């Protein structure tokens, strides 16, 4: 019942065009999906990395969306850090291929030989 009140208050705060507090009590409500959606709509790296670093590891999809927004924004390294934290090293190496980080991706593939075999042929 408190969650309903916080979600309604946050949606109202967004609707009056005050996304700052709206995201603030999105996060306080445990509604990180809507929080990340609004943050990506406004492209605010600060609170995006804040919530992504304070999100639960088991929240695989919220962290994937966090890293997706980070890579979509001008923060590829932040997306790489989020990918490494959540545990999808395959997508980390795919990002390093996308970010033209040849040496970093080669080191990662040394750490994960399957990742090297999969995503170092594109470097070839």
């Amino acid at each position: 019942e408190t969650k309903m009140l916080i979600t309604k208050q946050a949606d109202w705060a967004r609707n009056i065009k005050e996304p700052k507090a709206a995201v603030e009590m999105y996060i306080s409500a445990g509604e990180h999906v809507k929080a990340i959606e609004i943050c990506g709509d406004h492209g605010w790296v600060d609170m995006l990395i804040d919530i992504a670093r304070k999100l639960d590891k088991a929240e695989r999809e919220p962290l994937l969306l966090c890293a997706t927004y980070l890579k979509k924004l001008d923060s590829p390294g932040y997306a790489a850090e989020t990918y490494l934290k959540m545990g999808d090293l395959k997508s980390l190496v795919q990002l390093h291929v996308e970010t033209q980080r040849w040496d970093e991706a080669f080191a990662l593939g040394e750490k994960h030989p399957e990742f090297k075999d999969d995503i170092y042929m594109p470097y070839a």
Side-chain angles (χ1 to χ4, degrees), residues 42-49 51-52 54-55 58 61-68:
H42 284 301
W44 290 332
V45 180
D46 294 5
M47 71 215 67
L48 272 161
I49 186 172
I51 180 175
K54 264 76 76 179
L55 270 173
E61 198 276 322
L63 293 165
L64 283 171
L65 179 52
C66 286
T68 306

Side-chain angles (χ1 to χ4, degrees), residues 8-16 18-19 21-22 25-26 42:
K8 294 278 197 165
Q9 180 169 11
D11 203 359
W12 172 245
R14 174 254 311 265
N15 287 327
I16 46 171
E18 265 82 10
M25 78 284 292
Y26 290 164
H42 284 301

Side-chain angles (χ1 to χ4, degrees), residues 58 61-68 70 75-83 85-88 91-97 99:
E61 198 276 322
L63 293 165
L64 283 171
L65 179 52
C66 286
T68 306
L70 290 168
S75 63
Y78 284 151
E81 195 273 340
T82 307
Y83 273 121
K85 177 190 170 191
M86 61 95 58
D88 190 3
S91 291
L92 168 59
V93 184
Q94 181 176 353
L95 175 145
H96 274 305
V97 176
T99 62

